[PDB]
Structure formats: C-alpha cells, structure tokens
Amino acid sequence: IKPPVQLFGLDGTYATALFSASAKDSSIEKTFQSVQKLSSTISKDAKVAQVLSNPALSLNSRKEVVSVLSKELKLEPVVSNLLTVLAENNRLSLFDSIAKQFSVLNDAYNGVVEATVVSAKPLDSKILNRLTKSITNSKYVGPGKTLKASKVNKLNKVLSETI
Template sequence: MLASRVAARSARVAAPRFQPAATRGYAEAAKSAVNSKPPVALFGLDGTYASALYTAAAKTSTLDSVAKALENLSATFKKDVRLQGIMAAPSLDAKDKSQIIAELQKSTGDKGETLKNFLETLAENNRLSVLEGVCEKFGILMSASRGEVEMTITSAAPLDAKMLKQLEAAVGKSQYVGQGKKLKVVPKVNPDIRGGLIVEVGDRTIDLSVSSKMAKMNKLLSDSL
C-alpha cells in the first residue's frame, strides 16, 4: 500500500522547520489567468488550491490528464486510510516530502510537469494535508466545465444500477437540472442513515432517510410530552 511505502521512506523524523513559499505560488497564478478562470467559485483552502491547479492545467492544456491523475489519487486515499495521517505529519523535512511526492506520482500515473509542480508547491508550503480535499474539489470544477450537474445519492447500502438509472432519469427531467446540462450521478454509502435515501442536487438536499424520519418522530414525541 502507498502509505506503507511512504511511511518507510519517511521514518527519519526531523524537527519542524519553516519552508519558504514558492517564488510564485499557484494561488497567484490563478488570479492573473483570466482566460483559464475556474467555472465555479470554491471555498476553503482545498478549494483555493483546486482552483489554482485548474488554472495552471488549463493554461498548459493538461486538464484531462490532471483530472484523471487526481481521480487515481482519490481512489488511493480511499483504499489507504493511513496515507492522510502520514501527509499531515508536522515533522516531515524536505527529503521526506520529496520522497512522498515521488510515491504520489507513481500512484497517479501522471508524468507531466503541471501536477508535479503543484505537488511540490503543496509540500513547500506544508499543505500536503489538503491534497485529498483538492482531489474532490477539482472533480467539482471539471464537472462544471463539462456542463454537468452533480447529483449525490446517499443510501444505507449500495444501490443497484437499475435503481440509479431510474433516479437519474427522474431527476434529469426536473427543474433542478438546467437546460443543456448533463446529470452526473455520484452514489455514496452511509450505514448511519439506516435506510431510505438522501439526494443532493446542487444546493438542494432531499432527505428521505430513515434516520431523518426517526429524528423528526422523536422530536414530535418530545414536544408532545
């Protein structure tokens, strides 16, 4: 697993030290690149970095390759739960970070300079811990650039393909998907909802989960007694 390789290479612990920022950071590049402006505004530190990476990739015509690389990296984070903790360690020195970047690049399968430079910028600014969030936020930007509207369907257990297709068809004809837009279905599993569904389209959430209904019932009983 990637975390095991990273941990082995980063076993030598050094005292935290100040890492100077890059001469010109990705955030600065994003502000000046008018023609490659991200399609939607994102918030948070991971959103800022994702937007900056989008700008850099657009300027170098590497959006598709970077997007694929981050999809691979996102899958790695999901498989290797220890990886995030290793990357967030405050004791990593310059050599440790360089080795981590080399391992990350192997995981992405990307050999281009855009993502490599971005990873180096994160490392120099002690921001490798936001990388998992960057992967997710970059996906949002790519969906928006392709004219997609993301619909997240959360269920207590995995839904079969037929059910997902039915939900996609129903929501795709609704007012929540603008004309000329494509619906992108993102299934998620959360056993805590106990049953039912939570459907999120844009900024709208439809909570049909069993846990939500139980919470409402408990409140009603509490208020009545």
C-alpha cells in the same frame, strides 16, 4: 483566467490555481485520472498516510516521497507540481479537498448540476437549463421512481393554523 464558480476563496483556491495552467494545449483531460490515483493510494493503503500526516519529517523528505511514488503510478506532466506545493506549505493533510474541487470545474462549464427530487437528476451537457430540465423530467418520472410526502405535509399544516 478565472471561471465564475467562486468555490470559497482560501481553501477552495488550491484546485483553481492549477486549473489556469492546465487549461493550455488540452491538458484538462489527463488531470482528472491522475488526481484520483493520488487519493486512492493513500486512503486504502495504510502506508504513506501515517508517515505524511504527522508534523515531523522535513522539507526535503516530503518532496522525495512524492517524486518516488509518482514515477511508478500515473504522473509525468503537471501532476508532480501539485504535490510539491502542498509539502512545503504543510498542506498534505487535506489532499481530499484539492481533488474534489478539481472535478467540480469540469462539471460546471460542460454540464448541469443541482438536483430535483428523490435521488439525483440527469445533469445534461446541452446549453440552457430550461430546455434540458423539461425534456429530462418526463423521461425519468416514468422509468423507475419507486417513491419511498411534500403535498400531504402542506395540507395538514394549513388546517391546524385555522383551528
């Protein structure tokens, strides 16, 4: 099963390959919280980051370090197979790209995205985009909106071109 989200084709196909096997027997909800624990315990830790980003170690040494850290964290289902594929193919240096592409699949098929103005929009999970953007723009413009431009820049450029 391939979802219509494209997401590159070579580098972005890492998270899309494991999404086909995780979409069976309801196993997409536990993969979101398990993917965030692998990046938070390597970035702000200063321990397993320098010992894995180098071009040393071996094939059996990289697989034993991922299995020892997953037995005391939050990985017991299909989360252990994702780290073993990136260790033998030398893909452990870009662990943030595999975790970021996995969260974009759940937000596209079960919610909206894009933007509008100023900050972010609302990203509702209704159905169509025409009936959800009109009901959320009137409730967000009144509440908040500090406005800290587009109409003043277009009027000044039209007067300079005719002079």
